[PDB]
Amino acid sequence: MKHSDEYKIRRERNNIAVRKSRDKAKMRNLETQHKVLELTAENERLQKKVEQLSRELSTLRNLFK
Amino acid sequence: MKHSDEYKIRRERNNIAVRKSRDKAKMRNLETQHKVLELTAENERLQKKVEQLSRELSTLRNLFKQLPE
DNA sequence: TATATTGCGCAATATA
DNA sequence: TATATTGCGCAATATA
Numbered sequence A: 001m002k003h004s005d006e007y008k009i010r011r012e013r014n015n016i017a018v019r020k021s022r023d024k025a026k027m028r029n030l031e032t033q034h035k036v037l038e039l040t041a042e043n044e045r046l047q048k049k050v051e052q053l054s055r056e057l058s059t060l061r062n063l064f065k
Numbered sequence B: 001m002k003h004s005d006e007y008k009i010r011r012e013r014n015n016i017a018v019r020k021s022r023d024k025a026k027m028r029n030l031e032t033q034h035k036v037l038e039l040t041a042e043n044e045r046l047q048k049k050v051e052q053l054s055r056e057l058s059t060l061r062n063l064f065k066q067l068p069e
Numbered sequence C, D: 001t002a003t004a005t006t007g008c009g010c011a012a013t014a015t016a
Helices: A005-061 B005-065
Strands: none
Touching (some): A005 B005
């Protein structure tokens, strides 16, 4: 029923709502992808810190010898 | 929209390709969500280890500085 | 030549 | 009444 002016307005508003809904869904998907990058970097940083602390513990303990 | 047989064949092939591409993208999203769960559990393990070792080092440093010269 | 990926429209459906 | 979400599809673009 493309000719009705009420139809044209309804499609106009739904197209706006559809694009808004899909935009939000895309941002949620990107946020999840970004969380993977953040956690990967943070886990690498924490592993480096584990290794640094272990080196410092071993150096300090060598003062016993 | 042509509407030749060549056009109908091209639309059919693209429609199949679109569904296959969307299925793959949705599966990637599911894998990414699982990856977040795996990395969060690993992050919690690493935070606990860093805290444990930091306390151990702090206590050992305190012991050594209680020594006289 | 082809398939893969993408933003979008439509209408049905879900929800307020 | 309204906006929000989604299966199906289209055509432009990206890629092989």
